[PDB]
Scaffold this active site. Structure first.
Site, short mmCIF file in Angstrom:
data_model
loop_
_atom_site.label_atom_id
_atom_site.label_comp_id
_atom_site.label_asym_id
_atom_site.label_seq_id
_atom_site.Cartn_x
_atom_site.Cartn_y
_atom_site.Cartn_z
N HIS B 122 25.68 -43.79 54.88
CA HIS B 122 24.95 -43.91 56.13
C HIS B 122 25.76 -44.74 57.12
O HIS B 122 26.52 -45.62 56.73
CB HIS B 122 23.60 -44.58 55.81
CG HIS B 122 22.60 -44.62 56.92
ND1 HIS B 122 22.70 -45.50 57.98
CD2 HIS B 122 21.42 -43.98 57.07
CE1 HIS B 122 21.64 -45.36 58.76
NE2 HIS B 122 20.85 -44.44 58.23
N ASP B 199 24.09 -50.43 49.11
CA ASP B 199 23.08 -50.01 50.09
C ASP B 199 21.96 -49.34 49.29
O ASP B 199 22.08 -48.19 48.88
CB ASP B 199 23.70 -49.09 51.13
CG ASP B 199 22.68 -48.52 52.12
OD1 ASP B 199 21.46 -48.73 51.93
OD2 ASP B 199 23.12 -47.83 53.09
N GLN B 202 17.59 -46.16 49.94
CA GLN B 202 16.92 -44.98 49.41
C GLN B 202 16.69 -45.06 47.90
O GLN B 202 16.36 -44.05 47.28
CB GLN B 202 17.72 -43.71 49.73
CG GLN B 202 17.86 -43.43 51.21
CD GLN B 202 16.55 -43.04 51.87
OE1 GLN B 202 15.60 -42.62 51.20
NE2 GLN B 202 16.49 -43.17 53.20
N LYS B 225 10.85 -48.11 54.64
CA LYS B 225 11.03 -47.00 53.71
C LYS B 225 10.30 -47.24 52.40
O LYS B 225 10.12 -46.28 51.63
CB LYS B 225 12.52 -46.76 53.44
CG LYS B 225 13.21 -46.15 54.66
CD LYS B 225 14.71 -46.12 54.50
CE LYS B 225 15.37 -45.74 55.80
NZ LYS B 225 16.81 -45.45 55.52
N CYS B 363 22.37 -39.79 60.51
CA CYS B 363 23.21 -40.99 60.53
C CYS B 363 24.30 -40.93 59.46
O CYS B 363 24.67 -41.95 58.88
CB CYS B 363 22.36 -42.26 60.34
SG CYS B 363 21.16 -42.52 61.67
#
Ligand SMILES: *Cc1c(COP(=O)(O)O)cnc(C)c1O
Ligand SMILES: *Cc1c(COP(=O)(O)O)cnc(C)c1O
Ligand SMILES: [Cl-]
Ligand SMILES: [Cl-]
EC number: 2.8.1.7
Lengths: 405, 405
Positions: B122, B199, B202, B225, B363
């Protein structure tokens, strides 16, 4: 004209009890309570219209994006900015100052230059400039205080020179309630080619603010002191300046193109300065806070608050050994110490009575040092506070004095 | 075991109508809907317990401070960090990466060094590193993709050397749904003395995450999220690293002392990294989101979502000319294009049916370039989505294909 009883009915926290006693919340300068209209506007957004906002194609995302840009426009009208695109959404006053100090400061303040602040500044409007000065090798100059809590304006000739790049100055002191003569100072700063950042965190809830009339180059304030949600604030920057500023935070939504071989390009301002998912919920709440305040009318708020402040200062004359700090025409806050008692103890007794005041250095250690005290008590008199709450403060201080003397 | 019908009852947005049709929200990867429990926890805080939090003496402020540090502890347990003091509250994943890139990056990445990212990252996990590399004169190296959406792990010997200071790597791709083999890669990175930022934006909603087992040095994710409010996220940093990191943003609450003549000193971490008024409302909401997810159980969520994903992939086989991107064992998201039609048009027709998917580059422009497409559609299959919503997606794509072919 203003009806404090109808206003208080909008604020569910004001019915709360503390220590078994009815709460008198005199700490709005640290953060303001919020009306149902603000709380529910955010909650209803979450309940019925929530989506991601980066101009997504589906309906909820497109409508949420429009709601966010509408709040940006509403905020720009609230401070009479010329363009919505001169406003950047930040977490609060503090982040907005850090954004300017890095994006603008790093490109415009060089070794040997100087920046001017005042001795009454909140740490938010000190530390980012100390960091910038240390980064680039510049000097941080300080407008000193008079005993009555006003700036020693006579010192300005010795502080402004041709190397002065920036004046960073509070609109209203969060401790003293002093309102500084911004329009004057900005004229003088501009004569030297200096820019001016105004810390408006304690101004925007007390009377209308007009950044075109002020001619400030940057202006910052926080939503949560303006009867709005936490996590959101506004940085205003003059378009011509903002358009030249490089990005600060990097990531999604602030880019035009991203390439791992040909590098990355930036989008237009203000969007260049808003990386990643914004605080959409806070933005919705802030919009509702602006509508609520505008509906009451800032001149009506100012009138009621000025009369409440005059009443408190008159009543506090009957408290023995009370020391007040700051000018007679203070806005919003009363800073005080009671005899030789530590502010912490005075505030503890007041909390024991159900009265919430702030004690400590109020994120203004240089201000405390000027008055040669480690701490002060501070009572905020906001638009939902009443004469009876002032009476409770006065009586409490009298009882404390008598008990601890 | 999991009951999607009881879960959906907690989410007021899911009853909404779009275009006159019942909403099928398949865009949770861009941002998740929130349950009443999260919405109301924040609203109730505002309604009954609101105050400023910097360990103020009066009752509401003291209780609010305790609520905030309790959420910090709850979040640390959620990701099995060893200590609450290893977690920093940020606005989101993006701000957390920028914080690391500046505070840690500026002090640890020097001219001639290199940082490794992947081609599936991302923009949040690309741009801050591009900026850091440009600031210090370092090289940004890239793990490339296989056609099936996995990393070409065979390239790691050519990318890791003794000048590699950091691997920054996604846990789960927001486009492909690929889960990367983090524990493996982190072992290899640590062999070279490189640190690893993960990261996890998700990952944290789809299955348990355990940063002690991962041994990552930094870990970031966003509240919105994770069925929580906007404006709040978490940066985890190993205590030994975090304790050496200099502050990033400056201002109130992150200082120990402020002097205009003797300079300023910083408080301890994580508080050193949290300048100004925090997003207390978002923090309360995030705590409620963590409790809600933990009550459902992440292994129950993972089981239901995996079965929903298997069902969707099986059903999408009956869509003509459908191109899928990514591996068969994808988590959370299905990235696709329909024949030669532009993703924008496919997503428009789907929105016209009441179906919210995301279109564009997500993104992840380097990822799009790898697949030689400008855009993709993406459908998220989250814990409140149903087989019937998958059926609506499949039927919609069939109708679109037939109408536009
Ligand atoms: C959404 C996302 C981000 C950015 O999160 P924000 O909440 O917008 O800061 C970073 N990485 C991945 C993999 C994402 O999906
Ligand atoms: C509160 C305050 C700040 C800091 O605002 P945050 O909302 O905490 O970022 C800066 N300046 C003044 C004068 C303040 O009162
Ligand atoms: Cl983007
Ligand atoms: Cl402070």
């Amino acid at each position: 004209i203003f009806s404090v009883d109808k206003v208080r009915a909008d604020f569910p926290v004001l019915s709360r009890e503390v220590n078994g006693l009815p709460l008198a919340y005199l700490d709005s300068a640290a953060s303001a309570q919020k009306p149902s209209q603000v709380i529910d506007a955010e909650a209803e957004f979450y309940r019925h219209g929530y989506a991601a906002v980066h101009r997504g194609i589906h309906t909820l995302s497109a409508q949420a994006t429009e709601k966010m840009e509408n709040v940006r426009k509403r905020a720009s009208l609230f401070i009479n900015a010329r363009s919505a695109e001169e406003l950047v959404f930040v977490r609060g006053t503090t982040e907005g100052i850090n954004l300017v100090a890095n994006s603008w400061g790093n490109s415009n303040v060089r070794a040997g230059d100087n920046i001017i602040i005042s001795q009454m500044e909140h740490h938010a409007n000190i530390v980012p400039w100390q960091m910038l000065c240390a980064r680039v090798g510049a000097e941080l100059r300080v407008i000193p205080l008079n005993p009555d809590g006003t700036l020693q304006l006579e010192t300005l000739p010795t502080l402004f020179d041709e190397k002065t790049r920036l004046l960073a100055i509070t609109h209203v002191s969060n401790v003293l309630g002093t309102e500084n003569p911004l329009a004057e100072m900005i004229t003088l700063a501009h004569q030297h080619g200096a820019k001016v950042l105004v810390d408006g965190a304690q101004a925007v809830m007390h009377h209308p603010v007009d950044v075109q009339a002020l001619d400030c180059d940057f202006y910052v304030f926080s939503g949560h002191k303006l009867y709005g949600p936490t996590g959101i604030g506004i940085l205003y920057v003059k378009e011509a300046l903002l358009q030249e500023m490089p990005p600060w935070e990097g990531g999604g939504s602030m880019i035009a193109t991203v390439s791992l071989s040909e590098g990355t390009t930036w989008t237009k301002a203000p969007w260049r300065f808003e990386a990643g998912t914004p605080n959409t919920g806070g933005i919705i709440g802030l919009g509702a806070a602006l509508e609520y305040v505008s509906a009451l009318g800032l001149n009506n708020i100012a009138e009621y608050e000025q009369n409440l402040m005059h009443y408190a200062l008159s009543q506090l004359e009957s408290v023995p050994d009370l020391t007040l700090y700051g000018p007679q025409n203070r806005l919003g806050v009363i800073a005080f110490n009671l005899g030789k008692h530590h502010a912490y103890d005075v505030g503890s007794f007041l909390d024991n009575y159900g009265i919430a005041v702030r004690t400590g250095h109020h994120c203004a250690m240089p201000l405390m040092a000027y008055y040669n005290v480690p701490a002060m008590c501070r009572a905020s008199l906001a638009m939902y506070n009443t004469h009876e709450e002032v009476d409770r403060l006065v009586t409490g201080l009298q009882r404390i004095h008598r008990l601890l003397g």
